[PDB]
Symmetry: C2
Subunit: 123 residues, 2 copies
C-alpha cells in the first residue's frame, strides 16, 4: 500500500494491498503519522492517525482523525497503555493516536466502528 | 401511573397511563427518587432516576440507572445545567440524575436510546 510523505512504518509491519497510510495530521501544528512495530494494516484500509505497536486495522476500515469508535477491552488496553484515560466509551481516532495493541474493526451486525484489544498484543 | 414509596412528583407534572416511577435508587446509600416541576412521563414509561424540572420521558421508554443514552443538544443542555460536565457522548441514567430540560427518547431508525433537549425547557 501507499506510504505518504512524512509517514514512517515500524519493523515487522504489513501494509496490505491498496491500504493507505496518510502522512501528516490535519491542522497547523499537525504532526507526522507513524505506525509502530508489527502493525497489520488490512487490504484497502486507511490509516489517518499515528498507531503504536501491535495495532491492527481490519481490511476495508478507515481510521480517520474524526472517526468515532466504541471502545472494548478497556481493562486490557489500560495495561498496554497505562497513562491513557479509558474513562469513556466513544473516542475519536485522533484521541487514540499512538496507543499500543489497538484493533480497529467494524461490528458487522450493528454496523458500529469498534476499537478493541489486539488479542496477540497482550502476549 | 404508579408512584412508589419515597418518590416525589413536582408541580405541573403529568404521570402518564401505566407509567412507573420507582422510589429509591439502588445501593446502600441509594437515595430517594424525585421528579421535578412540569415533567411529562409518557404512558407505559419507567422512570428509575431523579429528574429535574421540565424533563420528558417518551411513552414506552425505560430510564433506568444503568441504561446508556447518547447525548444530543449538549450546548443547550449545558445552559440549563451549568455545573454538569457534558464532555462525553454516552451517559448512564444514574449520571444524569436531577438534571433539567432532559428529553429521553428512542431513535426509531437506529434504535439508539437518546438523551436530548426538551425544546420547551429553553423557553
Ligand atoms: Cl487501490
Ligand atoms: Cl399498566
Ligand atoms: Cl462517551
Amino acid at each position: 500500500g501507499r506510504i505518504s510523505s512524512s509517514a514512517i512504518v515500524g519493523e515487522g509491519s504489513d501494509v496490505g494491498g491498496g491500504a493507505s497510510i496518510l502522512g501528516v495530521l490535519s491542522g497547523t501544528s499537525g504532526n507526522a503519522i507513524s505506525v509502530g512495530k508489527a502493525c497489520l494494516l488490512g487490504a484497502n484500509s486507511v490509516t489517518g492517525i499515528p498507531l503504536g505497536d501491535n495495532c491492527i486495522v481490519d481490511a476495508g476500515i478507515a481510521v480517520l482523525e474524526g472517526t468515532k469508535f466504541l471502545l472494548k477491552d478497556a481493562e486490557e488496553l489500560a495495561k498496554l497503555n497505562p497513562y491513557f484515560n479509558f474513562d469513556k466509551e466513544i473516542y475519536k481516532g485522533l484521541e487514540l493516536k499512538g496507543l499500543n495493541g489497538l484493533h480497529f474493526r467494524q461490528d458487522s451486525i450493528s454496523g458500529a466502528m469498534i476499537v478493541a484489544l489486539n488479542k496477540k498484543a497482550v502476549k
